[PDB]
């Protein structure tokens, strides 16, 4: 037997890192109900006469 | 470590060995100096320019002091076995003895 | 944020075998009302579990 | 009664296993265990 | 439940008086007290060991 | 994960991340079938050693 | 010792009374309680950030 396994416990135990990044965001929506207005200034403006 | 080589006449002896455990913490160290920008841009031969050998010769020294104010912490630092590095009743063994009086 | 959950798995043992195909497989439920979890999660059967 | 709902596709599954050994086969033939010669006839 | 028994008749030394003589005391595989006079006490055994479930 | 990505006024707030490390250990599984040596050859029909 | 306060006579978020704002400068760095509150409190060094152990 051994005296004391109970301090051994930090080298034994192993690492599995396959619980890490296992999740992801939802899938992209705005595309379907919202379009891109691709712009460079500060403060876009939009105009219409009605 | 392992057991002595006993006498064996009747039959073989199995024996625990032993273990135990050790957690260190690391540290850091400054190396900082500051120095004004002009005497630097305005060195000479003689001053500011041997600060790079200054700064190697401390880092080699470094680990002289750090082992040295370690050993003048071991009252008040532990060892393994979780007392005083030097005490008096390190429960090592069944015959407690002490490393310190 | 969610966690871009989706139940597609449904275990359940023996007994509930004919009732979990009924929630999905049939597009009415138990009354001919309807089924909205028809073609939703896909059961596989099992008896490990009780 | 026992119900589980789970996703499938996810980077993860649930209630993972995990295979740390092989089904390795043991065995008591002959001349390897006392079972045999000290012993009855006996094999596990 | 506590894994660790010697149910065998077997030998192992445990230390009295000034010896350690043939004795069946702790004789187990987990600790939690006595773990510098255990090692003594709990010297591996010299015969035949054979182990089970006191879940005591 | 990340924090989700606030508005910006006029300064960034340096956030952090948490860690749920999970912590499990290992189990032994036997079984095994004590049979008499003589009888595994003392058969004709091919029984009694597939098992 | 104290292994940071992070003040820079600024906290990180102090929220009380449902109104989270920004002062006493109660940043800390270890996990001696309060861990799953101490993201809360933390996590949010709007200004700058300086380390000044109190060894407490």
Known sequence: ?50 | QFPKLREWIGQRVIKDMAAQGYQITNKLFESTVGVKRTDIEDDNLGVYGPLMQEMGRAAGAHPDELVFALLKAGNANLCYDGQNFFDTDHPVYPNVDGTGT | RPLDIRPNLLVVPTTLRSKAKEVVGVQRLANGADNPNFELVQVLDTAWLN | FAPAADPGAAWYLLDTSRSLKPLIYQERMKPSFTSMTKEDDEQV | EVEGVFVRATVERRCRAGFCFDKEGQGFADGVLSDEQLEALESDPLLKVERCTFSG
């Open chain 1, 1 to 50: 037997a051994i005296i004391t396994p109970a301090l051994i416990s930090a080298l034994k135990t192993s690492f599995q890192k396959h619980f890490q990044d296992a999740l992801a965001t939802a899938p992209s929506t705005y595309l379907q109900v919202a379009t891109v207005i691709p712009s460079t200034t500060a403060s876009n403006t939009y105009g219409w006469l009605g």
